[PDB]
């Protein structure tokens, strides 16, 4: 349970855009969320940053395009 939940604490799919939908100017709200690290996965619990996802469909952390799926960003 948090007291400072904001829009831009979202999944790694939000990190794929990272400048398209953040929408600063609102107020923080209180709900269920993840701590200072371990961003939210595609479904369920929030795994740490290394094996988050690679978002197209959100692929798992074992896929190679040549872009190996990595922590947040892609080596493209």
């Amino acid at each position: 349970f948090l007291y400072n939940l904001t829009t831009c604490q979202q999944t790694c799919r939000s990190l794929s855009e990272a400048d398209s939908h953040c929408l600063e100017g609102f107020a923080p709200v209180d709900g269920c969320g993840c701590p200072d690290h371990t961003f939210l996965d595609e479904k369920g619990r929030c795994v740490p940053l290394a094996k988050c996802s690679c978002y197209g469909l959100y692929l798992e952390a074992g896929d190679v395009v040549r872009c190996v799926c990595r922590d947040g960003r892609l080596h493209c």
Binding site: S16, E17, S20, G56
Partner: protein
Amino acid sequence: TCALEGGSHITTFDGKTYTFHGDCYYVLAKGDHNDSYALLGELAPCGSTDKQTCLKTVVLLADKKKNAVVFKSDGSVLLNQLQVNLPHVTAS
């Protein structure tokens, strides 16, 4: 009516059927003014050789080119990299 049938058989608006076999995104139709629309389409190889091509993705850039609509080849219509539910009726 312009048609894109098979993997590679373009029939233009004025007759004129031809075969292409590409590998890229291609501009299929776009409005000339500054904005109006643009219809893209991926014609990439799907089989073994380069002469076995297929249509894979239709991209529509509408409403002063600020809305991108993507038609993947499994259903999966998605507006601005986000899944939508069908039907989806808007103003334009």
